[PDB]
From Swiss-Prot:
Belongs to the type-III AFP family. This is Type-3 ice-structuring protein HPLC 12. The record marks Q9, N14, T18, Q44 as: Important for ice-binding. It comes from the Eukaryota. Contributes to protect fish blood from freezing at subzero sea water temperatures. Lowers the blood freezing point. Binds to nascent ice crystals and prevents further growth.
Length: 65
C-alpha cells in the first residue's frame, strides 16, 4: 500500500540529500513516507545509506514528522 523513500544511490554519511538520491517504492517495513521527499532535500543523513535501503526517521538529522 504505502510508499516509502528508498535510496536511489548510496548516500554517504554526513551528506545533504538531493532529489536524485531518493525514489519511492512500496516496501516493508514502512519508512519515511514518499510524500516527504521535498522536505528531506538538504537534510543530512547520520550514517551511510546503501543503494535500495529504506530511509527511516532515525537516519535523518533533524527529521520529525
Amino acid at each position: 500500500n504505502q510508499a516509502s523513500v528508498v535510496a536511489n544511490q548510496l548516500i554517504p554519511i554526513n551528506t545533504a540529500l538531493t532529489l536524485v538520491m531518493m525514489r519511492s517504492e512500496v516496501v516493508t517495513p514502512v519508512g519515511i513516507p514518499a510524500d516527504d521527499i521535498p522536505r528531506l532535500v538538504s537534510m543530512q543523513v547520520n550514517r551511510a545509506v546503501p543503494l535500495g535501503t529504506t530511509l527511516m526517521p532515525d537516519m535523518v538529522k533533524g527529521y520529525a514528522a
